[PDB]
Amino acid sequence: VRFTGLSLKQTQAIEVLKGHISLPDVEVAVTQSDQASISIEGEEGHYQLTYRKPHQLYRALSLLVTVLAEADVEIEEQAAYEDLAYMVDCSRNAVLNVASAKQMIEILALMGYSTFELYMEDTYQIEGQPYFGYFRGAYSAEELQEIEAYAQQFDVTFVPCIQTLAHLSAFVKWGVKEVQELRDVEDILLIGEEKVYDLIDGMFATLSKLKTRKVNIGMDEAHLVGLGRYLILNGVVDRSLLMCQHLERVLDIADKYGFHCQMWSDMFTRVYLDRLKDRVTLVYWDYYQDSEEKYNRNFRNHHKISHDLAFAGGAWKWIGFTPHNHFSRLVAIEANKACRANQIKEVIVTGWGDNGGETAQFSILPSLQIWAELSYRNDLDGLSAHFKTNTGLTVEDFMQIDLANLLPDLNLSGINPNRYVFYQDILCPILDQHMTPEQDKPHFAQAAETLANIKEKAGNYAYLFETQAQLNAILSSKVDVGRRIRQAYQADDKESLQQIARQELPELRSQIEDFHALFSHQWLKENKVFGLDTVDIRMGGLLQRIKRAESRIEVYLAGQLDRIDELEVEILPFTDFAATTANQWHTIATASTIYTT
């Protein structure tokens, strides 16, 4: 490959990208042109390539390397969105380690994204605030800089997303006057407390070390704001006016460092509210609605409050171990259309990691590529081709990663058997009324097999599929094991009961142990160590609870127990097709109390 008209930065950028795409031996004249977002015209080895914004160069490289795998080229793209971002969750225990950010950045550049974002509640370090990020693998000064300089190498912008009021639970739990006197109630900060605004200066001082001056201050919906220690200290007061007062301060502080802020639309007296509108850009986030009409309605409502407005679509990796690229696809197609129709200039793909961040960071590349293709092409013609160029796997192959979520009974958001079938108890299976083993067992077994095959097309992403394979395997047996223990018990089939206890549940422990190793592997590749411990604890307990099932059945079989109380209890519906959406661990694993004091 000999490209003309390129720079030194572009060349070093393209050297790293060589580790992803295989460039052909061709003459290529690269030049910046406003003509279109991306353009390529050529034949017989010589091809002229153009881009408006420099980061489009790297997607153009992916488009070229693709076409020239077959044909000897007429390509033109007119991008819909001025900005296209992906936002990694780094506050739910999964802290994306620095080597994984780079890879991420690399992939994103080839994809067409202009922006990279990290969501960091307490998970960046702040001078003179030792409890903030304490043992949570918080990013340091230099770490955030390294990551941003790397995004700079591809002309991709970095944007930290933080929280200036609520969603700081990991921080506020620490019982020291320094932390506790910053608190309103639950996860929220004490509004009006000068010490709280000291910390908010802290937040910005640290972020000002960066080159970016774009930030998401957060300021999401926190229902008890003003209602806890605020009430004791100050009496009943107008909660809308309390919120504004706070937002006014935070924005003044940002302006001190010259930050231009964004915040979640959730919060949005009126003269207070119309004044602070001008200073900020609201993000309407929606990961659920399945129609263009429902989005167009919501856009219309946010346009009544403000037109300075970005959209936050979603790549579903916040429901346990297994993402949902299939659902993501469905909502992106519909959101893009509504974003387009409503002149939305900015789109943020969010990859939250609710309840422990157990889904792999890279599991959502399809969803990312989908949004990229929607933006530049307005359709999914080049999706798989460009995707296989970018990852070395077909997008249909890659999306089978979802399988542990794809029960046939099921399109609609967040049915997550991947997680609730895995952490459910054995002796006390409270999700049992939501299994159809007639349908679920053979589905899970087939997935294991499929995923096993795909592990082998998967390259340096194989670790993802190896984990899902092992998972699905566990679920095909585990989905009804407890039900089978009940049916055996209720028929006094001690023979079968023995088989399960003596042979089946220890296998399950091995399989689960096996799962833990692969998961631990996945985690340390992708993330810092910190947070993993939560997972240790949770499967430790699952495993020990498997030992209980074994021990309780043996004492019975040995005549040392008259009944077995657990199995006597009649299982109710866990919540209100049979499946459902249960995504809190402590509540899947037991009906006992584990958080109450």
Ligand X SMILES: CC1=N[C@@H]2[C@@H](O)[C@H](O)[C@@H](CO)O[C@@H]2S1
Residues that bind ligand X (CB under 6 A): 220-221, 264, 285, 318, 352, 354
Q: Is 356 in the site for a copy of itself (CB under 8 A)?
A: yes
> Least distance in Å: CB of 424 to ligand X?
21
Give the residue with the Cβ less far from a copy of itself, 411 or 597.
Answer: 597
Residue 116 or 574: the one with the smaller Cβ distance to a copy of itself is: 574
323 binds a copy of itself (CB under 8 A): no
Site for a copy of itself in 180-199 (CB under 8 A): 185, 187
> From start to end of 295-405, where are the E strands?
309-314, 346-351
Distance separating alpha carbons of residues 360 and 377, to the nearest angstrom: 28
CA angle, 3 then 84 then 343, to 5°:
120
Interface size with a copy of itself, residues (CB under 8 A): 75
Site string for a copy of itself, 493-512 (x = CB under 8 A): --------------------
What is the nearest approach in angstroms of a copy of itself to the Cβ of residue 569?
5
Binding residues for a copy of itself restricted to 421-450, rule: CB under 8 A: 425, 427-428, 430
Beta carbons of 40 and 73 less than 8 angstroms apart? yes
The entry of a copy of itself, ligand X, none that residue 427 binds, CB within 5 to 8 Å by partner kind: a copy of itself
Exposed (0-12), middle (13-18) or buried (19+): which is 509, by Cβ within 10 Å?
middle
Binding pattern for the stretch 153-172 against a copy of itself, x by CB under 8 A and - elsewhere: ----------------xx--
The item of ligand X, a copy of itself, none sharing an interface with residue 220, based on CB under 5 to 8 Å by kind, is ligand X
Residues 6+ apart with CB under 8 A from 383: 369, 370, 373, 395
Question: For residues 56 and 112, is the Cβ–Cβ distance under 8 A?
Answer: yes
Q: Residue number with the shortest CB distance to ligand X? A: 352
- Count of C-beta atoms within a 10 Å radius of residue 499: 13
d(CA 473, CA 457) in angstroms, rounded, equals 19
What sign for the dihedral angle of Cα 292, 576, 321, 150?
positive
CA distance 29 to 4: 5
Closer CB to a copy of itself, 329 or 545, in the complex? 545
C-beta of 187 vs 432, nearer to ligand X: 187
Please identify, using beta-carbon distances, which residue of 128 and 408 lies nearer to a copy of itself. 128
Which position has the token pair 């096993």? 452
C-alpha torsion sign, points 166, 167, 168, 169: positive
Residue 264: contacted member of ligand X, a copy of itself, none (CB under 5 to 8 Å, by partner type): ligand X
584 binds, among a copy of itself, ligand X, none (CB under 5 to 8 A by kind): a copy of itself
With binding defined as CB under 8 A, does residue 377 bind a copy of itself? no
490 part of the interface to a copy of itself, by CB under 8 A: no
Site for a copy of itself in 122-151 (CB under 8 A): 130-131, 134-137
Question: Could you tell me whether strands 38-43 and 74-77 are parallel, antiparallel, or unpaired per DSSP bridges?
Answer: antiparallel
- Residue ranges in 577-596 that form contacts with a copy of itself under rule CB under 8 A: 582-587, 589-596
Tokens of 273: 């509210």
Nearer to ligand X among residue 317 and residue 486 (C-beta) = 317
285 binding partner (options a copy of itself, ligand X, none; Cβ < 5 to 8 Å by kind) = ligand X
- State the Cα–Cα distance between residues 118 and 140, nearest whole angstrom: 13
In degrees rounded to 5, what are phi and psi of residue 83?
-150, 140
By CB under 8 A, residue 228 contacts a copy of itself: yes
